[PDB]
Design a protein around this ligand. Structure first.
Ligand SMILES: *[C@H]1O[C@H](CO)[C@H](O)[C@H](O)[C@H]1NC(C)=O
Ligand SMILES: [Mg+2]
Ligand SMILES: [Mg+2]
Ligand SMILES: [Mg+2]
Ligand SMILES: [Mg+2]
Ligand SMILES: [Mg+2]
Ligand SMILES: [Mg+2]
Ligand SMILES: [Mg+2]
Ligand SMILES: [Mg+2]
Ligand SMILES: [Mg+2]
Ligand SMILES: [Mg+2]
Ligand SMILES: [Mg+2]
Ligand SMILES: [Mg+2]
Ligand SMILES: [Mg+2]
Ligand SMILES: [Mg+2]
Ligand SMILES: [Mg+2]
Ligand SMILES: [Mg+2]
Ligand SMILES: [Mg+2]
Ligand SMILES: [Mg+2]
Ligand SMILES: [Mg+2]
Ligand SMILES: [Mg+2]
Ligand SMILES: [Mg+2]
Ligand SMILES: [Mg+2]
Ligand SMILES: [Mg+2]
Ligand SMILES: [Mg+2]
Ligand SMILES: [Mg+2]
Ligand SMILES: [Mg+2]
Ligand SMILES: [Mg+2]
Ligand SMILES: [Mg+2]
Ligand SMILES: [Mg+2]
Ligand SMILES: [Mg+2]
Ligand SMILES: [Mg+2]
Ligand SMILES: [Mg+2]
Ligand SMILES: [Mg+2]
Ligand SMILES: [Mg+2]
Ligand SMILES: [Mg+2]
Ligand SMILES: [Mg+2]
Ligand SMILES: [Mg+2]
Ligand SMILES: [Mg+2]
Ligand SMILES: [Mg+2]
Ligand SMILES: [Mg+2]
Ligand SMILES: [Mg+2]
Ligand SMILES: [Mg+2]
Lengths: 19, 48, 117, 56, 142, 150, 110, 103
RNA sequence: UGUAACGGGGCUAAACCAUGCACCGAAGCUGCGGCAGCGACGCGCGUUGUUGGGUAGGGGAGCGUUCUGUAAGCCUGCGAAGGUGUGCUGUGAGGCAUGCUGGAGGUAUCAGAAGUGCGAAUGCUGACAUAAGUAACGAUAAAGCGGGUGAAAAGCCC
RNA sequence: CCCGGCGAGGGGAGUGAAAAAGAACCUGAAACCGUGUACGUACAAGCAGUGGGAGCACGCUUAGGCGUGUGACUGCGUACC
């Protein structure tokens, strides 16, 4: 089995923006 | 004539389709619905 | 009428695991990996019942070529000779006699030359 | 960085081929008491090279 | 009955000495490669080394046709980036004359363990003398 | 299934298979995909197809010599020992008795004998005319069955 | 004639104890004790107490000497793991396994 | 001494006393079979090469056993095409015992 | 990035053109044995012709599982189910026998009914791997020694 | 009763039809982890099999082939959904 997932937590880096 | 010597008439009791029970059965995976589109979906199909 | 799958599922997995004995790592222990290995073993087996007939004829011809050249004739001409002499002894037997009875093979080669000359 | 494929029990074994402990080559025997001891170390009762150096 | 297979503990390996003097390189190499594998014996088995030991004498006097003496180029890469080295046939004959027969034969032998084992039975020499009198090598005209 | 309609975790970002209900049939403790309801398993049997079936069965019982015909079949008092004795005299153990008037004494006397059953001509069923080895019908019973089948 | 001593549910991973268990496999009990006495491992203490128990069992129960005995079979099986929660950064939890071992030592004259 | 004869669309090199496994013959177990088409007969030094059937060449054999060979699993598999087929095969054999070889 | 524009070796033919005869070469064709579909033809059984790559998909026929009747029967402590080996057997799903384990259930046949078959769904729950004996042991205010207690003391007590 | 810290744990003894029913207890599958034995493996390149196949070990019911395990070497061969 798998534990209940966590709510969002702080992220170290911004996702790169490709545009 | 006993309760374990009574057979139905030949062809009177045809075995119903069972979809999605393996390759061998011939109704495996897609279950005779084909690939994608409205008609492959649960409750899928246009009105009369 | 609820049906538990345990006994039947166990029997099926064991049957595949039994056919996967001798295979490396997960291929002899892990059903998912073993199943793929037994199917592929089957595919190869079916393919190699045909290749076996090719490989053995290839081996027989190589040996006949060798034992014919020792007697002073090529394979190509030797078989042509035998067919003109109306000799129907097949390559499996020719190859067998080339190894085990070199006197009898020399006799076949002599009949080959006679049919050509 | 992390594995793309689960390393085998075989590969695990091979990495641990250098993990084996080395047993003490041999124990020295004091000349007076007669006790076995680590070479260049005092005995359990407190002897070193036949001399009583520490009391108990 | 099952087809005969040679056994690598009951096979007859014979010693032959060949003079390469004026012999075309490739046309010699094919015969060597044919007699190292075992393709000339009725007992031939692709998975067994049934071939003969061949001593090749006078490898420095091997012949090539056309302008191959100056123009044939042997390339090897050292493994270091930019490490593509080349020697002409004449440079190979001047420096390491044994390698020209060995390279030519190695390329005509099966690739893999058995092929490498077959090559081990080829004893190439530059001069007219070998050290294998003990093995009583028979003369083989190729 | 008892539980909330709360979406277990957010649709996207967690890295887990999207979940909508803790009651999903895919889940342990979840619903049964096609949960059974109470059913009526009863079938329609055409009157003529029922009567034609009994006629076929009763006709087989004659040819297999499983139907025994007697003028009268009763016992003295409601005692199982009396009927048991009468059945080891008439030479049958497993038997279905059809009688004109459902005599209370004969009914009570065959109640604790599991291989023996006692009914009236109107109370015959197709399964009981096949299940039992022998069928012992009174003269009156045959004159009630005929008139009921025709 | 074989005598068995076990330390079941021993607090140590089977990996760590096995290092020490490979030092005395097939040795004489006297030659095994010394080795364990000067092996600087927690597992050396655990396994020494099982070997000493094995010897005691072989002297009291299965009437034998302390001179002829050898460590004939030694093996360490993975015992039940105790599950503990370790708090990591950003309110995330890891599941620590405190691994236990079953330490078996067999001694015999043969 | 050995002879070469064609049976069951194959050829067999055989000597007196040998048991030979052939493709099924419609013959009873114990009854003898006369292979009349012998391709070669070799008596050490003297060798009789036939063109294509030896004059007076005959191999007398005794039918010692009919049977089914080792089970072979025929597996057919078309990856990604939802197609799999499996079939078992056991090929009939007749063990003959070569009683005499006459030319 | 490295020969890198014959697959390679090598080739002055082992190249090219013409001519000829050999041979090799496929799951094609033939031979031998076996199975199945369909149509002829005689009486379910023979002979004969022909066919049998296959996704979506249509048609046909089966295997096994749990439950109901048959069954107050039949098998079973002289060992049931389940587990685990082995041998045999069928075209397949499968079947049968039996050693060991197990210690009380099982169930023929012919019918009847389905929660009836799992490798995938970033499926669900539990268990267990991997990385790995790796990272880390939470403020760089800091310890040292003697004695004590104890199975054991860097950490406890003095 | 014995080893151990007046431990944990275990070995005897005894109970029981059974303790490999010892309470972490009916059965006790699989992944996973070990110990022992046989064979292979330190000049060798890739879906790890398959066709061919030597050698070695073991067991037999011709003293002989056959059965089992292993698989040097070699042809072919880029998982599944
Ligand atoms: C982490 O990513 C989130 C989006 O998921 C935000 O962009 C946030 O600002 C990011 N933080 C950093 C430090 O880049
Ligand atoms: Mg899961
Ligand atoms: Mg289809
Ligand atoms: Mg789809
Ligand atoms: Mg589409
Ligand atoms: Mg569609
Ligand atoms: Mg919907
Ligand atoms: Mg149930
Ligand atoms: Mg296994
Ligand atoms: Mg990837
Ligand atoms: Mg290490
Ligand atoms: Mg190749
Ligand atoms: Mg529920
Ligand atoms: Mg009505
Ligand atoms: Mg917090
Ligand atoms: Mg360049
Ligand atoms: Mg041809
Ligand atoms: Mg072919
Ligand atoms: Mg064909
Ligand atoms: Mg076809
Ligand atoms: Mg088809
Ligand atoms: Mg049950
Ligand atoms: Mg039943
Ligand atoms: Mg289901
Ligand atoms: Mg599963
Ligand atoms: Mg699937
Ligand atoms: Mg983990
Ligand atoms: Mg690391
Ligand atoms: Mg580090
Ligand atoms: Mg660190
Ligand atoms: Mg701290
Ligand atoms: Mg101190
Ligand atoms: Mg302590
Ligand atoms: Mg401190
Ligand atoms: Mg202080
Ligand atoms: Mg105790
Ligand atoms: Mg019980
Ligand atoms: Mg238990
Ligand atoms: Mg297990
Ligand atoms: Mg080596
Ligand atoms: Mg090398
Ligand atoms: Mg490698
Ligand atoms: Mg390949």
């Amino acid at each position: 089995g798998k534990p209940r997932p966590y709510s969002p937590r702080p992220t170290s880096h911004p996702r790169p923006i490709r545009v | 004539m006993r309760l374990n010597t009574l057979s139905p008439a030949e062809g009177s009791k045809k075995a119903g389709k069972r979809l999605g029970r393996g390759i061998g059965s011939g109704l495996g995976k897609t279950g005779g619905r084909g690939h994608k589109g409205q008609k492959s979906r649960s409750g899928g199909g246009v009105r009369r | 009428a609820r049906v538990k799958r345990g006994v039947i599922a166990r029997a099926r997995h064991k049957k595949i695991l039994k056919q996967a004995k001798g295979y490396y790592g997960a291929r002899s222990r892990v059903y998912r990996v073993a199943f793929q290995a037994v199917i592929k073993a089957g595919q190869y087996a079916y393919r190699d019942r045909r290749q076996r007939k090719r490989q053995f004829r290839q081996l027989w011809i190589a040996r006949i070529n060798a034992a014919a050249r020792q007697n002073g004739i090529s394979y190509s001409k030797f078989i042509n000779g035998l067919k003109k002499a109306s000799v129907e002894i097949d390559r499996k037997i020719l190859a067998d006699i080339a190894v085990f009875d070199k006197v009898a093979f020399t006799a076949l080669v002599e009949k080959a030359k006679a049919a050509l000359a | 960085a992390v594995q793309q494929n689960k390393p085998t029990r075989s590969k695990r074994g091979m990495r641990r081929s250098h993990d084996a402990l080395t047993a003490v080559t041999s124990l020295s025997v004091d000349k007076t008491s007669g006790e076995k001891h680590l070479r260049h170390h005092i005995t359990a009762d407190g002897y070193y090279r036949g001399r009583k150096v520490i009391a108990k | 009955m099952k087809t005969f297979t040679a056994k690598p503990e009951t096979v007859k390996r014979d010693w032959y000495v060949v003079d390469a003097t004026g012999k075309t390189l490739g046309r010699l190499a094919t015969e060597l490669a044919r007699r190292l594998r075992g393709k000339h014996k009725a007992e031939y088995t692709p998975h067994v080394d049934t071939g003969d030991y061949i001593i090749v004498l006078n490898a420095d006097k091997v012949a090539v046709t056309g302008n191959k003496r100056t123009d044939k180029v042997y390339y090897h890469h050292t493994g270091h980036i930019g490490g593509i080295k080349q020697a002409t046939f004449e440079e190979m004959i001047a420096r390491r004359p044994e390698r020209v027969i060995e390279i030519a034969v190695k390329g005509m032998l099966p690739k893999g363990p058995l092929g490498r084992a077959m090559f081990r039975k080829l004893k190439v020499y530059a001069g007219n003398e070998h050290n294998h009198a003990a093995q009583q090598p028979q003369v083989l005209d190729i | 299934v008892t539980g909330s309609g709360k979406k277990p975790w957010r649709q996207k970002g967690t890295g887990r298979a999207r979940s909508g209900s803790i009651k999903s049939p895919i889940w342990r403790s979840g619903g049964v995909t096609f949960a059974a309801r109470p059913q009526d398993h009863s079938q329609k049997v055409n009157k003529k197809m029922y009567r034609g079936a009994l006629k076929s069965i009763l006709s087989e019982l004659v040819r297999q010599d499983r139907l025994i015909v007697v003028e009268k079949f009763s016992v003295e008092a409601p005692k199982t020992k009396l009927l048991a004795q009468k059945l080891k005299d008439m030479a049958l153990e497993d038997v279905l008795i059809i009688t004109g008037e459902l005599d209370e004494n004969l009914f009570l006397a065959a109640r604790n004998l599991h291989k023996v059953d006692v009914r009236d001509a109107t109370g015959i069923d197709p399964v009981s005319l096949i299940a039992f080895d022998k069928v012992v019908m009174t003269a009156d019973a045959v004159k009630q069955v005929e008139e009921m089948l025709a | 004639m074989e005598t068995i001593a076990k330390h079941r549910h021993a607090r140590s991973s089977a990996q760590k104890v096995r290092l020490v268990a490979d030092l005395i496999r097939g040795k004489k009990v006297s030659q095994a004790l010394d080795i364990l006495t000067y092996t600087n491992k927690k597992a050396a203490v655990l396994v020494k107490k099982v070997l000493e128990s094995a010897i005691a069992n072989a002297e009291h129960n299965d009437g034998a000497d302390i001179d002829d005995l050898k460590v004939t079979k030694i093996f360490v099986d993975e015992g039940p793991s105790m599950k503990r929660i370790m708090p990591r950064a950003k309110g995330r939890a890891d599941r620590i396994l405190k691994r236990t071992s079953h330490i078996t030592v067999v001694v015999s004259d043969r | 001494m050995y002879a070469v004869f064609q049976s069951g669309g194959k050829q067999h090199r055989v000597s007196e006393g040998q048991t030979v496994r052939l493709e099924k013959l419609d013959i009873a177990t114990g009854e003898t079979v006369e292979f009349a088409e012998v391709l070669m007969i070799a008596n050490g030094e003297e060798v009789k090469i036939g063109v294509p059937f030896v004059d007076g060449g005959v191999i007398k054999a005794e039918v010692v056993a009919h049977g089914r060979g080792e089970k072979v699993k025929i597996v057919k598999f078309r990856r990604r095409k939802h197609y799999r087929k499996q079939q078992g095969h056991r090929q009939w054999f007749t063990d003959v015992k070569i009683t005499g070889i006459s030319a």
